[PDB]
Amino acid sequence: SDIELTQSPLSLPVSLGDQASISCTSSQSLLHSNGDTYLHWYLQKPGQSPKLLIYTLSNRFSGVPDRFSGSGSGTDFTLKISRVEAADLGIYFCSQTTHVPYTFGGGTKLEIKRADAAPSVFIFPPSDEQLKSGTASVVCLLNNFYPREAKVQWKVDNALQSGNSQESVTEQDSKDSTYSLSSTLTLSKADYEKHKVYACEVTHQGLSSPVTKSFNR
Amino acid sequence: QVKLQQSGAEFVKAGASVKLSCKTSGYTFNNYWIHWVKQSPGQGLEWIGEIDPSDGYSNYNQKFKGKATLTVDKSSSTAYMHLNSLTSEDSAVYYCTSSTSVGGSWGQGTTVTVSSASTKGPSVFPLAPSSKSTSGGTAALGCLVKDYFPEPVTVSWNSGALTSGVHTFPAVLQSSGLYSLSSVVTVPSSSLGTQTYICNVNHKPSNTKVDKKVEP
Q: Which CATH number fits domain A114-217: 2.60.40.10, 3.30.930.10, 2.60.40.420, 2.140.10.10?
């Protein structure tokens, strides 16, 4: 049915000043009967709308710097940034408007590469104030790590927890290019009070082994 | 290119309808069309439909036909999209866009939040520093800002004095329909008990303001 646009890679870690290339492949030819190929590229910065960079295959949009260029076939396309600047970080999307319905790629995140940095791991028991409210949230904090990929697992008296934790991740830090992550495990107070040992086990590329932070109540 | 000014955030119950608008403006003799685009966590970017502002001719993505109706008020040069029978899958940012042969511009986006939750101020809980929150001179502390609706809440530390090393995490939507986030800061271990750390929380929709001291 609808034209599928597939972007590669999903995540593109680069250094400022590097050349960068993002590809888009279409499940149908985007060559229109009028001879134009309606394949467009956007950049979406955090908290903004997408902004047009390249239109109709290779035309640079008004106001877009010369470091951006587009090329390709009727089904295979490439966006190139000759030298990446900080202003270029964000999510890149391809889009086709040759055929109705118009469709978009899934996005490619351009981020800053840096050397591996293991997380600093901190654990917070629930407050007495919250225990009085009938709920218990235990928080695990992974601070200043790279790359973004990390596994956090909760163990309560050695039982693996599944489905009762939620994770949130910051944007990449402007100064040190790291991420931080909170993992929040939520129990009813009744459940919380029946158990003794609360542990978050963290796996990350920057660590030799998994690290476990825990407390005993 | 045409300048686009979209209407403000909408919060509605499941089953409700919403009308979004997009004021257009420009000195251009370029033929242009107007489009609406959905951006959701579940589906990414999706084109809804297009409309020719000169004659009102409209063409839809079959997925949105009947869900969305596009119109233009030619006198005000304002484009409208009416969305009906709303469900949680309709919660998204909706953009109005323009296209010409030489490109196009996108409006700012209008967030539509479809939920049965009522407005509710947060509970604020300390994330106390301890031996479990210290890493060789460096201690972490925070505040859990839990069970509020709608977004956003604002959090500052020490009435705005303390910005360095602060991470205020994106909010998560809980299965209750209420939001939760944490705000953390890393500080000197030696400062604890000496320096006060207070998280200042403000949830404007409920007019909930709370200053919470966090300590061992």
A: 2.60.40.10
